[PDB]
Design a protein around this ligand. Structure first.
Ligand SMILES: O=C1Cc2cc(Cl)ccc2N1
Ligand SMILES: [Mg+2]
Ligand SMILES: [Zn+2]
Length: 156
């Protein structure tokens, strides 16, 4: 149907970070190049059928992030909201987890809430998720060295 949410997010490529336009509908989560000059979404780079999503949760953030992903001291500025992306969340599907970084806690919340809504009736929703990122061939949370490894932490 229509776009539920449209945001510019920093996403981690399949093992590099890219700044992309993300669109959510009841059918698809998709991502696009952003045409900054014309102020429009550019060419589609990927799509995930919502029915394939098994898990959407927050990700324990990086220990030593670059400035682009540093969490500011607590408490909308035009530059910061397209330059800084320190709040990460994970979308889990058949082809492993996708890591998306939001510029604000509120934007990440909006996305996690709307994604949990659109996936609510999916057949393969999981009871366990990975609180930490997959990095250098292993999950930091449980040291498991397979991306499709069952979640090491039970969802509350
Ligand atoms: O590396 C990536 C980033 C991405 C986003 C989406 Cl929505 C789908 C697939 C992929 N693969
Ligand atoms: Mg537009
Ligand atoms: Zn784990």
């Amino acid at each position: 149907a229509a776009v539920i949410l449209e945001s510019i997010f920093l996403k981690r490529s399949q093992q590099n970070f890219k700044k992309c336009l993300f669109l959510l509908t009841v059918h698809k989560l998709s991502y696009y190049e952003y045409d900054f000059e014309r102020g429009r979404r550019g060419s589609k780079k990927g799509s995930i059928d919502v029915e394939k999503i098994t898990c959407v949760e927050t990700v324990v953030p990086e220990k030593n992030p670059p400035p682009e992903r540093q969490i500011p001291r607590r408490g909308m500025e035009q530059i910061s909201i397209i330059e800084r992306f320190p709040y990460p969340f994970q979308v889990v599907y058949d082809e492993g987890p996708l890591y998306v970084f939001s510029p604000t806690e509120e934007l990440r919340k909006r996305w996690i809430h709307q994604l949990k809504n659109v996936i609510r009736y999916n057949s393969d929703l999981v009871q366990k998720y990975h609180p930490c990122f997959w990095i250098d061939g292993q999950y930091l949370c449980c040291s498991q060295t397979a991306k499709n490894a069952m979640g090491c932490q039970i969802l509350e």
